[PDB]
């Protein structure tokens, strides 16, 4: 972008909304590409500030969610804190 | 990258695995930023080619999945085909 932004909540409602729409499409596009390049199945569930639901699935949301329910094994699970910890691990 | 790649399945297993790891982290990082910038709660469920589960949630996976189950309103729903159609609409 024109400038480096800090990762911190956007207060201007319009900006936030503008950013949200663009970055959500951004995110869905990266998910499509991951799902095709590496033959994986992906589901994505987003609730905005207004608790409105936006969803994406590579192929079929219900198929992925059910396979999720059938999963019976320790797996990789990450949160924002993991990401943030990993970003100190990197840097420059 | 050094070269523009086509979005199509990667045949070399190592490359695919290498791509998978990097792009998944990429995807989770974009989701972290979206969730912080725009005060969103996000869940992400990925099954690789080997049907192994990788999950991310901004805060707590079970909280998001339950709020999902409670949702009863028509909302935005996207698939790979939507994304692909949206890209053909605008190349420039």
């Amino acid at each position: 972008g024109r400038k480096k932004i800090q990762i911190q909540r956007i207060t201007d409602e319009r900006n936030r909304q503008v950013t949200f729409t663009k970055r959500k499409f951004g995110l869905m596009k990266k998910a499509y590409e991951l799902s095709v390049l590496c033959d994986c199945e992906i589901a994505l569930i987003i609730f905005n500030h207004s608790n409105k639901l936006f969803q994406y699935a590579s192929t079929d949301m219900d198929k992925v969610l059910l396979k999720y329910t059938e999963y019976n094994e320790p797996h990789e699970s990450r949160t924002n804190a993991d990401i943030i910890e990993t970003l100190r691990k990197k840097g420059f | 990258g050094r070269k523009k790649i086509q979005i199509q399945r990667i045949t070399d297993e190592r490359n695919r695995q290498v791509t998978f790891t990097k792009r998944k982290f990429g995807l989770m990082k974009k989701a972290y930023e979206l969730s912080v910038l725009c005060d969103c709660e996000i869940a992400l469920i990925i099954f690789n080619h080997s049907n192994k589960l990788f999950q991310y949630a901004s805060t707590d996976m079970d909280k998001v999945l339950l709020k999902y189950t409670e949702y009863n309103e028509p909302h935005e729903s996207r698939t790979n085909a939507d994304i692909i159609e949206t890209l053909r609409k605008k190349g420039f």
Binding site: - | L65, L66, T69
Partner: peptide, 14 residues
């Protein structure tokens, strides 16, 4: 519908 039902059914019971 029934999938939403099944999801909540398994997250609960944990």
């Amino acid at each position: 519908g029934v999938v939403k039902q099944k999801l909540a059914e398994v997250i609960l019971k944990k």
